[PDB]
Design an enzyme around this catalytic site. Structure first.
Site, PDB file in Angstrom:
ATOM      1  N   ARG A 186       0.750  -1.085  -0.081  1.00 43.85           N
ATOM      2  CA  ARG A 186       0.092  -0.047   0.101  1.00 43.85           C
ATOM      3  C   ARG A 186       0.855   1.065  -0.020  1.00 43.85           C
ATOM      4  O   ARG A 186       0.373   2.264  -0.586  1.00 43.85           O
ATOM      5  CB  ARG A 186      -1.057   0.066   1.143  1.00 43.85           C
ATOM      6  CG  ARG A 186      -1.852  -1.217   0.956  1.00 43.85           C
ATOM      7  CD  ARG A 186      -2.836  -1.680   2.037  1.00 43.85           C
ATOM      8  NE  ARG A 186      -3.319  -0.398   2.650  1.00 43.85           N
ATOM      9  CZ  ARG A 186      -4.015  -0.687   3.593  1.00 43.85           C
ATOM     10  NH1 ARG A 186      -4.135  -2.024   4.150  1.00 43.85           N
ATOM     11  NH2 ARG A 186      -4.554   0.244   4.623  1.00 43.85           N
ATOM     12  N   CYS A 247      -0.139   6.474   8.779  1.00 40.73           N
ATOM     13  CA  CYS A 247      -0.663   5.183   8.412  1.00 40.73           C
ATOM     14  C   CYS A 247      -1.710   5.349   7.414  1.00 40.73           C
ATOM     15  O   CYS A 247      -1.455   6.130   6.513  1.00 40.73           O
ATOM     16  CB  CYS A 247      -1.091   4.245   9.594  1.00 40.73           C
ATOM     17  SG  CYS A 247      -0.760   2.639   8.733  1.00 40.73           S
ATOM     18  N   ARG A 248      -2.750   4.655   7.611  1.00 45.09           N
ATOM     19  CA  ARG A 248      -4.113   4.934   6.815  1.00 45.09           C
ATOM     20  C   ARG A 248      -5.163   5.747   7.567  1.00 45.09           C
ATOM     21  O   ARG A 248      -5.720   6.621   6.972  1.00 45.09           O
ATOM     22  CB  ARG A 248      -4.748   3.609   6.199  1.00 45.09           C
ATOM     23  CG  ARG A 248      -6.341   3.417   6.739  1.00 45.09           C
ATOM     24  CD  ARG A 248      -7.340   4.058   5.991  1.00 45.09           C
ATOM     25  NE  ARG A 248      -7.755   3.127   4.572  1.00 45.09           N
ATOM     26  CZ  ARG A 248      -8.784   2.931   3.897  1.00 45.09           C
ATOM     27  NH1 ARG A 248     -10.035   3.051   4.118  1.00 45.09           N
ATOM     28  NH2 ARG A 248      -8.329   2.104   2.871  1.00 45.09           N
ATOM     29  N   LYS A 249      -5.256   5.262   9.063  1.00 42.92           N
ATOM     30  CA  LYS A 249      -6.337   5.993   9.638  1.00 42.92           C
ATOM     31  C   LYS A 249      -5.773   6.146  10.970  1.00 42.92           C
ATOM     32  O   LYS A 249      -6.752   6.213  12.010  1.00 42.92           O
ATOM     33  CB  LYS A 249      -7.583   5.300   9.691  1.00 42.92           C
ATOM     34  CG  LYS A 249      -7.190   3.781   9.896  1.00 42.92           C
ATOM     35  CD  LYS A 249      -8.606   3.038  10.521  1.00 42.92           C
ATOM     36  CE  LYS A 249      -8.572   1.542  10.405  1.00 42.92           C
ATOM     37  NZ  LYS A 249     -10.086   1.196   9.831  1.00 42.92           N
ATOM     38  N   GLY A 250      -4.337   6.231  11.224  1.00 44.82           N
ATOM     39  CA  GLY A 250      -3.966   6.334  12.590  1.00 44.82           C
ATOM     40  C   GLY A 250      -4.018   5.421  13.597  1.00 44.82           C
ATOM     41  O   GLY A 250      -4.130   5.808  14.932  1.00 44.82           O
ATOM     42  N   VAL A 251      -4.227   4.160  13.087  1.00 42.56           N
ATOM     43  CA  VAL A 251      -4.168   3.087  14.141  1.00 42.56           C
ATOM     44  C   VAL A 251      -2.769   2.389  14.236  1.00 42.56           C
ATOM     45  O   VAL A 251      -2.351   2.544  15.380  1.00 42.56           O
ATOM     46  CB  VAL A 251      -5.412   2.016  13.693  1.00 42.56           C
ATOM     47  CG1 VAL A 251      -5.334   0.838  14.665  1.00 42.56           C
ATOM     48  CG2 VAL A 251      -6.676   2.702  13.731  1.00 42.56           C
ATOM     49  N   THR A 252      -2.312   1.642  13.083  1.00 43.26           N
ATOM     50  CA  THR A 252      -1.202   0.891  13.564  1.00 43.26           C
ATOM     51  C   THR A 252      -0.009   2.003  13.672  1.00 43.26           C
ATOM     52  O   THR A 252       1.314   1.554  13.478  1.00 43.26           O
ATOM     53  CB  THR A 252      -0.718  -0.056  12.611  1.00 43.26           C
ATOM     54  OG1 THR A 252      -0.835   0.347  11.216  1.00 43.26           O
ATOM     55  CG2 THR A 252      -1.785  -1.408  12.714  1.00 43.26           C
ATOM     56  N   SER A 274      -3.827  10.593   8.856  1.00 41.66           N
ATOM     57  CA  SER A 274      -3.412   9.742   7.982  1.00 41.66           C
ATOM     58  C   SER A 274      -3.609   9.898   6.633  1.00 41.66           C
ATOM     59  O   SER A 274      -3.749  10.954   6.059  1.00 41.66           O
ATOM     60  CB  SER A 274      -3.597   8.334   8.822  1.00 41.66           C
ATOM     61  OG  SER A 274      -2.663   8.035   9.768  1.00 41.66           O
TER      62      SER A 274
END
Length: 293
Positions: A186, A247-252, A274
């Site tokens: 990604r 990241c993508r949505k500030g999770v990992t 993100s």
């Protein structure tokens, strides 16, 4: 004990005895913060079925800025406060977080980071998650947990959070290091972002790629400091200089922060918006893909 550096990671053994000691209560609250892609696993159901005794379910979906167009955005302080308060957690409690991910840890870091950004320091992640708890035979239950409500107060700690404007400026200042925790594909643009309509893949310019799963071990336990340290190093990430994780949505991305903290750097900030928000707000010139030119 809140700390220059508080206990970021507790162990299964540790959690188990506390439970047995009748430790779970106002001073110690356990939380399940599992979340899975729609149509794969059912976190809440899974939780209702088996959870560490006295554990509560923390709902990511509930705890967020419902009014934002972006994914899982930080709630406001009041919001956060009322939420954790209802879970019987005061400014004095030590919060232990876990998830059921097969990797061992997915969403837990996120919650850990959420407490800190709101001003709580005594919060930690169960190393090797529910995965490990189960694998070891610790006690599980379905009985309902009903904590007595507590009052919590929160305060935003602006330094551990970055916004759109801030990451944009960084484009020019180059003052902080931008590290992306997404899957290589990604990041590179080779694979698509899932669960979105029209969302292209790729990464902000001048970001570095550090795939979350690389910080865990086959058994689903965090790597050791020495291991983590060499990782950031091989990547040319200087723990000494400022760092922003996305990241993508500030999770990992929170996995970058926890790893740095066990490495001595507690000040990795997280770009909450993100790639999801970036992709929808920034000029396309600010990003790159190994595709659409």
């Amino acid at each position: 004990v809140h700390q220059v550096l508080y206990r970021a990671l507790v162990s299964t053994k540790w959690l188990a005895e506390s439970v047995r000691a009748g430790k779970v209560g106002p001073g110690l609250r356990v939380l399940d913060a599992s979340w899975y892609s729609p149509g794969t696993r059912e976190a809440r159901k899974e939780y209702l079925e088996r959870h560490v005794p006295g554990a509560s379910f923390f709902d990511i979906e509930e705890c967020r800025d419902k009014a934002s167009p972006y994914e899982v955005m930080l709630p406001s302080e009041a919001g956060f406060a009322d939420y954790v308060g209802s879970l019987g957690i005061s400014n004095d409690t030590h919060v232990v977080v876990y998830d059921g991910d097969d990797l061992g840890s997915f969403y837990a870091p996120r919650v850990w980071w959420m407490f800190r950004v709101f001003g709580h320091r005594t919060v930690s992640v169960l190393n090797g998650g529910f995965r490990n708890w189960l694998k070891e035979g610790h006690p599980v239950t379905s009985e309902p947990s009903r904590p007595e409500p507590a009052i919590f107060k929160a305060t935003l700690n602006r330094s551990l959070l970055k916004t759109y404007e801030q990451v944009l400026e960084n484009l020019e200042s180059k003052r902080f290091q931008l590290v992306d925790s997404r899957a290589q594909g990604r990041y590179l643009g080779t694979q698509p972002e899932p669960d979105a309509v029209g969302l292209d893949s790729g990464h902000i310019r001048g970001s570095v790629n550090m795939p979350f799963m690389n910080f865990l071990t086959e058994d689903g336990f965090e790597k050791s400091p020495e291991e983590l340290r060499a990782m950031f190093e091989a990547k040319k990430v200087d723990l000494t200089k400022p760092l922003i994780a996305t990241c993508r949505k500030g999770v990992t991305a929170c996995h970058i922060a926890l790893a740095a903290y066990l490495c001595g750097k507690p000040d990795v900030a997280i770009y909450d918006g993100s790639w999801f928000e970036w992709f929808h707000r920034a000029p396309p010139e600010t990003w790159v893909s190994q595709g659409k030119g």
